[PDB]
């Protein structure tokens, strides 16, 4: 639940470093070490294998500081049109990474912590039930670690 915001911030921080951006927007107010790394790896493999994979989806959202959670939720739900997967869960984290990158390119660095919040919310409401049902994050480590 709050480990979840823990994993969201790790992933986004990692992607922003990777690309030459600042990561200081976050938190600007070991158990999951295996999960965090597995996720980092999974996201990297995903993006290698699909470069421009969220063009449409980001274009649909078009974030600005006036965007609300509901438009985010609505567009994220497109990833999950057939239900939850480990693969669609990895795509969700990449999608969030691509939005934070897009926000920083538009000189809207404020959105980055908003996006993390949104992601943690969404993960907690719609994705945790399925993760719980399908082995928790241990299963995730098993398959991607």
Whether the Cβ atoms of residue 126 and residue 39 lie closer than 8 Å to each other = no
Alpha carbon 83 to chain centroid, angstroms: 17
Q: What is the CA radius of gyration of the chain?
A: 14
- CA nearest 26: which of 35, 17, 38? 17
* Beta bridge pairs of residue 83: 81
CA-CA distance, 96 to 15, in Å (whole number)?
A: 10
Going along the chain from its start, the domains and CATH numbers come out as: 1-145 (1.10.437.10)
Experimental structure resolution, Å:
2.5
CA angle 41-95-79, nearest 5°? 105
Residues forming beta bridges with residue 81, ordered by sequence position = 83
CB 4 within 8 A of CB 128: yes
At a CB cut-off of 8 Å and minimum separation 6, what does 142 contact?
135
Structure tokens at 34: 């295996």
CA separation for the pair 97, 20 (Å, rounded): 13
């Amino acid at each position: 639940s709050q480990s979840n915001r823990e994993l969201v911030v790790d992933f986004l921080s990692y992607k922003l470093s990777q690309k030459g951006y600042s990561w200081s927007q976050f938190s600007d107010v070991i158990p999951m070490a295996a999960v965090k790394q597995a996720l980092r790896e999974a996201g990297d493999e995903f993006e290698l294998r699909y470069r421009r994979a969220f063009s449409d989806l980001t274009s649909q959202l078009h974030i600005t500081p006036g965007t609300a959670y509901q438009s985010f939720e609505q567009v994220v739900n497109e990833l999950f049109r057939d239900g939850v997967n480990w693969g669609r869960i990895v795509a969700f984290f990449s999608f969030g990474g691509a939005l934070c990158v897009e926000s920083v390119d538009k000189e809207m660095q404020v959105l980055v912590s908003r996006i993390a919040s949104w992601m943690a919310t969404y993960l907690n409401d719609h994705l945790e039930p399925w993760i719980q049902e399908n082995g928790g994050w241990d299963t995730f480590v098993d398959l991607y670690g």
